[PDB]
Specification:
The structure is a homodimer.
Chain A (H helix, E strand, L loop, with lengths): L1 H35 L8 H25 L9 H8 L7 H18 L6 H17 L6 H20 L2 H12 L10 H19 L15 H36 L3 H20 L12 H5 L5 H21 L6 H22 L7 H9 L1 H6 L3 H12 L5 H17 L5 H16 L1
Helix pairs in contact in A: 1-4, 1-5, 1-6, 1-8, 2-4, 2-10, 3-6, 3-18, 4-5, 5-6, 6-7, 6-8, 7-8, 7-16, 9-12, 9-17, 10-12, 12-13, 13-14, 14-17, 16-17
The structure holds pentadecane (MYS), N-octane and chloride ion (CL) (2 copies).
Chain lengths: 430, 451
């Protein structure tokens, strides 16, 4: 039995890596199309503005459609659903999710909306686990939860090419802490390592995000990151509040009727088509080009301006209900705000000879740490992506600080809240 | 009916997930700070006793006959100081110390901080300053654990959660103080106390708060300079990985074997002194003086371990020399640890693992010249695999290395060799060294109490 699981775990890990890489290029292409066909009519504005809006607006509707029609549970993140699956409180209908999630996400993210690939991959992988589990007629609690977990782990792993963060996210956030789930971390890790291998086979060494080697963080500077951490400690809960509000707002709008939902979906999707060409920092998955530029140099206000247009943009796309993630998007917000802070810090304290870069990094994982409450995952994730270990303290101070203050301030873990709302809404409706 | 019910109860456990009482939180910070201080204090102290020795030993440098005698005596006395203080005032302070902190977290073992704190400190200061093959984490983790319980007692916090959290926070802050590895410290806890979290007794935030405080005091007293500096090792192309899985297989076998040797040698020593304070304190001075000699003749066979090795081993040596220093240190760590001296077996394993990994590298680099392999990368890959298969904390091994080494481009090889060894060793009938020692320390506990 154990070797079987171990073996199966490894299979799910590999599959998830393939599907993941697949989705990741499948999204790039749809983007390449929309961009290569938008460069054609680029001659005159008479047909540039229209296409821009139409393409993404249409690609978005595709997404919203498939979800609302075939698989409702493929909307939004997906992580909350997988958590629900592990808790034996939510189904895993891969037969309609895998297709929907993949194609829908392909539309929505391809449209240029502000959503991440992690949400989708982690759920796809979560389901792949289940699938495999069923096409092998395995029915032990151990097998069920371990493979479901491996999928989830390997998924996030593949979304950021971050093996460590992958299991950390399972250990820290995915698995129901207060339960005997019978999940085998060693097995899950085996899956995660597989997916990482696949990732390498298809993308080589080259990391996703690429910062250089930033400066050091002398002791006499750490207090600043504490202050920076508090700022996120206040914004984190506030952000979850808005996510939940805005989510309600849309319900009142479409009442949940497909016709309407899909329509504003095209609306919201199109808005990202327009921003796409006029001030791009406002749209896009996020790190796609931002963390890197933010760790270079920018204007406090310009930086602080992008931050706000991105807050509204992410809230729209995510709350709307489209398949996609709030995770990655939050890492961008974090870097933005962290770079603004640090930008000011340098000026306000010349004696330190600071660099907004360090703060961009320090804050990269903090927003997510105050909203989702995965301090450890946030920190390690950032480490693997930016590889600047000389900033481990600033990173831990800022991220932990935000998390401490986020609870002390009334905040709740985002995923835990969204799941809560779905389990609440569930028994209620029915 | 049951599902509509399990939903109620679950949205509660969720909308209140990881929420830590402010008192514990506040104290975890105090406990972490305090542990780093006493932590770095110990490190300075051990380094001191070593300078006294090595310095007042180099004055009789030109007196060939007044050298070997001192090399023996100095280390012999110092070591004896350690063994004695342990055997007489606080027995639980002998050995690693982690298996006791582990027992404390399970209600199976008392934390007598009043005698262990000073005993372990000075005891470790002696045996380590002697030159014996012992790690400094042994003491620091136990010291940290004890400091945690102390604080807890003087402020009168009796809640099971405050108790389990600060004890664990002390342990983690201690582990990171020994290697300036914050993530590793916090991870050793997560990966080794799952049950503690299933019951809501420990909180990651609390432990993290404590660990980061010790990490800061460390920087305050030691600066940016890293414990050990390896270089920027080369990359590890996809076509290389299968090798690490093999190297991982070697460890999965050595792992369980080494653990038994640890236990068995621990027995030999037992039959010898039977338990009598003076037999023990003498065979301790012998083993300790023995290290004094190797100290100047065959230095690689002694010392804490990384104190000079995983850094020279990631540069250049020959396959035969490595295997020779390997087995030498395998027997040398056994003697020093199983004897009972206050000291860690953690860091010493990091060296056995690094050496063994360098050897495999060399062999591999030759057998497959097509890969252009640098032994160094395997040194790193294996630096944490032996401990990962003995202790069974693969995730800690990996992150610990990443933290001391800092060659993230080698994370795949690292994970493979470490997780591989662990899986295998477990499958092959292996037991967590600490769990085992704790189990045996409880067996011998009764074999007398109910005798
Ligand atoms: C593109 C070349 C294909 C070669 C694939 C080599 C795969 C080696 C991977 C070893 C992984 C060991 C995992 C152990 C847990
Ligand atoms: C040299 C003592 C400075 C202390 C700075 C502490 C910042 C958290
Ligand atoms: Cl997400
Ligand atoms: Cl130890």
């Amino acid at each position: 039995t154990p070797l079987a699981i171990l073996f199966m775990a490894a299979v799910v890990g590999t599959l998830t890596g393939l599907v993941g890489v697949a989705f990741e290029k499948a999204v790039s292409w749809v983007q390449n199309m929309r961009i290569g066909a938008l460069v054609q009519v680029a001659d005159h504005a008479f047909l540039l503005w229209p296409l821009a809006f139409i393409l993404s607006a249409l690609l978005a509707m595709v997404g919203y459609f498939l979800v609302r029609k075939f698989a409702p549970e493929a909307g939004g993140s997906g992580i909350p659903e997988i958590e629900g699956a592990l808790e034996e409180l939510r189904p895993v209908r891969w037969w309609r999710v895998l297709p929907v999630k993949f194609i829908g996400g392909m539309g929505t993210l391809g449209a240029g909306m502000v959503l991440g690939r992690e949400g989708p991959t982690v759920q796809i992988g979560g389901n792949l686990g289940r699938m495999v589990l069923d096409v092998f007629r395995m029915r032990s609690a151990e097998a069920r939860h371990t493979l479901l977990a491996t999928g989830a782990a390997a998924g996030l792993s593949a979304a950021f090419n971050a093996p460590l963060a992958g299991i950390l996210f399972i250990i820290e956030e995915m698995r129901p802490q207060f339960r005997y789930n019978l999940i085998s971390i060693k097995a899950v890790f085996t899956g995660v390592i597989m997916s990482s291998i696949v990732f390498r086979i298809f993308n080589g060494e080259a990391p996703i995000i690429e910062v250089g080697k930033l400066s050091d963080a002398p002791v006499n500077t750490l207090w600043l990151y504490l202050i920076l951490g508090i700022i996120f400690g206040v914004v984190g809960p506030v952000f979850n509040s808005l996510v939940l509000r805005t989510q309600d707002m849309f319900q009142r709008f479409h009442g949940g009727e497909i016709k309407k939902w899909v329509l504003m979906g095209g609306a919201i999707g199109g808005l990202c088509g327009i921003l796409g060409l006029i001030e791009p920092a406002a749209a896009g998955g996020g790190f796609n080009l931002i963390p890197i530029a933010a760790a270079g140099n920018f204007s406090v206000g310009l930086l602080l301006f992008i931050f706000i247009t991105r807050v509204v943009t992410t809230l729209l796309c995510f709350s709307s209900g489209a398949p996609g993630g709030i995770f990655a998007p939050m890492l961008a917000l974090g870097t933005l705000l962290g770079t603004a802070f640090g930008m000011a810090a340098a000026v306000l304290f010349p004696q330190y000879h600071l660099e907004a870069g360090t703060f961009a990094i320090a804050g990269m994982g903090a927003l997510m740490a105050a909203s989702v409450r995965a301090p450890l995952t946030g920190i390690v994730l950032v480490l693997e992506m930016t590889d600047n270990y000389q900033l481990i303290l600033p990173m831990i101070i800022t991220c932990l600080g935000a998390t401490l203050l986020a609870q002390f301030l009334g905040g709740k873990p985002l995923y835990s809240t969204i799941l809560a709302r779905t389990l609440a809404k569930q028994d209620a409706e029915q």
